[PDB]
Write a protein that binds this ligand. Structure first.
Ligand SMILES: *[C@H](/C=C/CCCCCCCCCC)CC(=O)/C=N/CC(=O)O
Lengths: 257, 246
């Protein structure tokens, strides 16, 4: 039944709303200009300095730590979402762990697009906006931790997915049976099969004009895995140049690979 | 309607047949049993003898390079049969082939692999997976990751009629760098993705979401290609031939 597939879509969206406080629909309204929601914009060093008057070491390192602590919170949100995916909690525990390990960054980058346009990124739950140019002007190697994410986001945002669509898509990502070290691949793939079915139907119904959106969206997984691999190499660089800089343990355990 | 998609499938199947001499069907016959058994290369002495039927690590890598150059010409000709492709801006055609060939090379190589080895020399030979893996570095860990991709890819149990369309989808990727006019490329890939999906629903009706699983294997191809190019740089730190091969 299509109807079981719709009930799954409905369940996952419902769970997405409950897990991620800043949705795409909120993010767009803030970016588009829909009076009370307007972000303070950070574009230079004085602007950033002033930003702490109302928004919530060294500048580039302070930014990078902010991004770290934010990534940690998003892991917690994504972890809470994953538990809602039917069957995920019933899987072997080591695999639950493994699927989060490989899935969580791919999700962070997918959802972070929702917060981005061509000229910058929302911060502090939408209260701020930090320009692309400001981030790109940052002392090397930090200069371009963010540029690939912008490049992905402008391409990805042109698919025009809304939160409904994304709730099913990020569920597909977590439950990838091709993750390294997985003990029982088969139960994971049967869940994903079901999830892929749900996504396909949801896109057909919600984007009836958008030809082969399902395939176009699945092909984006490639862009996501490229973004992760480049990040990790960048992290290796920082750990050696910035020997005085500390990485959150949670994050270190994900990257251990 | 679907009869346009079917026409497009048959066209590409027929073109794939005329372009690639060793088909998957033919390679499986040889791998499984069924047309002399290929000459097997599992040792240093088997290699030495196998040359007479048909420095060591290096002569083997130069052979993949030679056969890769052959495969590029066969893929080029196949590309030209894909509806729309020759009508694209010439620079974009070159660009599509340049970036797409490595991906298609690995896809098609999986047809000639099992978990224990790979056919060579138009299937007259069979080099074992263990003899490749044993080769001194960095030539050992070279072919192993295509074997692992090939094991997973092959489980989908795709046939030649399915791969013909899948290959076409790869070639028409609108995200290649430097493309001048992305629209007609994506427009053709849309039409190909539609033919692929309907092919897989008729040809594999019990195979749930095979279409999606196949598309998810593109993430595996690009990761592979990106690793291959990364081992080549390290080999470049090990006359007219270099030119041919580049
Ligand atoms: C880090 C960048 C994320 C973009 C957010 C804007 C910059 C940070 C300002 C403070 C944000 C307030 C919510 C990309 C990333 O994944 C970094 N990770 C650190 C790590 O070690 O993985």
């Amino acid at each position: 039944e299509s109807a079981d597939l719709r009930a799954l879509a409905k369940h996952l969206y419902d769970s997405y709303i409950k897990s991620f406080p800043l949705t795409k629909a909120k993010a767009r309204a803030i970016l588009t200009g829909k009076t009370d929601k307007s972000p303070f914009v950070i574009y230079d060093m004085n602007s950033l300095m002033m930003g702490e008057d109302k928004i919530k070491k060294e500048v580039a390192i302070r930014i990078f730590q902010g991004c770290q602590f934010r990534s940690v919170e998003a892991v917690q949100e994504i972890t809470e979402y994953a538990k809602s995916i039917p069957g995920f909690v019933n899987l072997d525990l080591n695999d639950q762990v493994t699927l989060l390990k490989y899935g969580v960054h791919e999700i962070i980058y997918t959802m972070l697009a929702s917060l981005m346009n061509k000229d910058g990124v929302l911060i502090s739950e939408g209260q701020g906006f930090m320009t692309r140019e400001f981030l790109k002007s940052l002392r090397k190697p930090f200069g371009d931790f963010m540029e690939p994410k912008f490049e992905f986001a402008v391409k990805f945002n042109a698919l025009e997915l809304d939160d409904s669509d994304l709730a099913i898509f990020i569920a597909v990502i977590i439950l990838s049976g091709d993750r390294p070290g997985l003990l029982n691949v088969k139960p994971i793939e049967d869940i994903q099969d079901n999830l892929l079915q749900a996504l396909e139907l949801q896109l057909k119904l919600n984007h009836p004009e958008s030809s082969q959106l399902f395939a176009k969206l699945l092909q984006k997984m490639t862009d996501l895995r490229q973004i992760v691999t480049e990040h990790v190499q960048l992290l290796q660089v920082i750990k050696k140049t910035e020997t005085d800089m500390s990485l959150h343990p949670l994050l270190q355990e994900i990257y251990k690979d």
